[PDB]
Amino acid sequence: AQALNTLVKQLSSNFGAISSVLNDILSRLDPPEAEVQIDRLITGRLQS
């Protein structure tokens, strides 16, 4: 149970990027700046 509960809570971690919501950086940043920051949350969520 508490291995899943770690895994769900790390959705909301920023991993050093701007938001942990991809609705935020896609609908606010420039498309070359969105695609660098959305590249950062992918690897961060993968290590979870």
Binding site: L26, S27, R28, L29, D30
Partner: protein, 45 residues
Amino acid sequence: LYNSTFFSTFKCYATKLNDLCFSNVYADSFVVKGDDVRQIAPGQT
């Protein structure tokens, strides 16, 4: 308003027309210098 070149910045903190969906939105109007438009920006303390 945005599709115009009579203006100088349109800087928002385009994605700027779909990010614009919130509550009471203001129109804070004031007279700046060109060295003061520079600091109409978040922070700039």
